[PDB]
Amino acid sequence: PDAQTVTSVRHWTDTLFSFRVTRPQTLRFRSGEFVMIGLLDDNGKPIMRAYSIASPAWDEELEFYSIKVPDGPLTSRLQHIKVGEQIILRPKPVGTLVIDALLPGKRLWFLATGTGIAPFASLMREPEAYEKFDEVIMMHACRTVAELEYGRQLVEALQEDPLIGELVEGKLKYYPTTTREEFHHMGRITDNLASGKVFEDLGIAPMNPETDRAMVCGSLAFNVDVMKVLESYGLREGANSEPREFVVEKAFVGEGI
Ligand SMILES: Cc1cc2nc3c(=O)[nH]c(=O)nc-3n(C[C@H](O)[C@H](O)[C@H](O)COP(=O)(O)OP(=O)(O)OC[C@H]3O[C@@H](n4cnc5c(N)ncnc54)[C@H](O)[C@@H]3O)c2cc1C
Ligand SMILES: CCCCCCCS[C@@H]1O[C@H](CO)[C@@H](O)[C@H](O)[C@H]1O
Numbered sequence: 001p002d003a004q005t006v007t008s009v010r011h012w013t014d015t016l017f018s019f020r021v022t023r024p025q026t027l028r029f030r031s032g033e034f035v036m037i038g039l040l041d042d043n044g045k046p047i048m049r050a051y052s053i054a055s056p057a058w059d060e061e062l063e064f065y066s067i068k069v070p071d072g073p074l075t076s077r078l079q080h081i082k083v084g085e086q087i088i089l090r091p092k093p094v095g096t097l098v099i100d101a102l103l104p105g106k107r108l109w110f111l112a113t114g115t116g117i118a119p120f121a122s123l124m125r126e127p128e129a130y131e132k133f134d135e136v137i138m139m140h141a142c143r144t145v146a147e148l149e150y151g152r153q154l155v156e157a158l159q160e161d162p163l164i165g166e167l168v169e170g171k172l173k174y175y176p177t178t179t180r181e182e183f184h185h186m187g188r189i190t191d192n193l194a195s196g197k198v199f200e201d202l203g204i205a206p207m208n209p210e211t212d213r214a215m216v217c218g219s220l221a222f223n224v225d226v227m228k229v230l231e232s233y234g235l236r237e238g239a240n241s242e243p244r245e246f247v248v249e250k251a252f253v254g255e256g257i
């Protein structure tokens with residue numbers, strides 16, 4: 001296990017924070033993949049958990065978007081990490097959220113809830129996403145507006161950037177929604193896709209197997225529901241050894257906080 005130093009930390013809500021760490025020189029990955037990271041307990045025993053790398057493959061530093069679980073073995077400790085302190089990291093990437101598992105197309109959809117946006121914070125910054133596909137749709141559904149902030153600022157930084165912030169316009173479309181707090185756009189991803197509301201709001205044609213591709217990251221129950229909706233539009237689940245129209249990955253184990 002490689003120990004890496006935290007370079008920056010930002011909290012967002014009472015259950016969410018993000019941090020950046022130095023990257024192991026031996027680490028080579030594809031945007032969307034995850035790695036095991038952790039800390040040592042009081043007895044020096046490692047507490048490891050899977051984390052999507054939230055930074056693109058070209059970033060010289062690694063970024064992570066994390067939940068804070070009450071009494072959670074890892075995050076009850078990780079939430080207190082400070083710049084200069086170190087975390088543990090297994091520089092062996094894995095995961096199913098890789099562009100190599102999708103057939104080239106015109107529109108790439110990122111469907112995520114909560115911290116599930118993590119792998120997409122990486123992919124939205126991955127040049128290949130805008131090369132192998134023409135448009136990227138970021139659908140992020142959370143309970144409140146504060147939970148959407150990390151993603152909002154990231155999207156804003158991309159669309160507002162002097163250099164590419166103009167070259168991204170029209171290519172990266174952001175569709176955030178809340179399921180509880182009043183917001184200009186609300187509703188679950190499954191519902192807005194099934195009712196066609198999202199197609200209407202974005203002014204686009206319905207989802208189809210020929211031009212649309214999707215990546216899903218939320219609870220297991222969310223993944224299962226979303227998969228059904230994607231299939232109801234003709235898309236099929238693919239893999240690295242057989243690219244199709246969509247791939248999914250659990251954002252966590254269990255029901256979620
Ligand atoms: C492939 C994969 C990728 C993951 N990527 C991330 C990531 O990028 N960021 C992140 O914060 N976590 C991610 N997780 C979850 C992560 O592995 C840990 O569960 C998390 O850090 C909590 O650890 P814990 O020891 O404190 O709590 P645990 O004992 O691990 O979890 C207790 C519980 O709290 C809920 N929980 C755990 N993680 C989350 C979460 N992220 N969102 C909502 N509820 C949760 C679940 O119900 C869970 O059973 C990922 C998990 C998998 C399997
Ligand atoms: C060459 C200018 C590129 C501008 C688009 C990215 C704006 S967002 C930018 O992304 C980087 C990549 O992970 C991070 O290191 C950085 O901290 C973050 O602010």
Ligand SMILES: CCCCCCCS[C@@H]1O[C@H](CO)[C@@H](O)[C@H](O)[C@H]1O
Nearest residue numbers: 003038039040041084085086087088
């Ligand atoms: C002895 C050098 C290698 C140990 C680093 C692995 C992370 S372990 C980790 O370290 C942080 C301090 O940097 C502490 O704040 C935290 O409580 C501890 O669990």
Ligand SMILES: CCCCCCCS[C@@H]1O[C@H](CO)[C@@H](O)[C@H](O)[C@H]1O
Nearest residue numbers: 124125126127128130131164167168
């Ligand atoms: C952090 C990276 C953000 C993405 C910047 C705008 C992508 S622009 C995009 O790029 C592709 C190659 O990558 C080309 O094939 C395509 O023709 C061009 O329009």
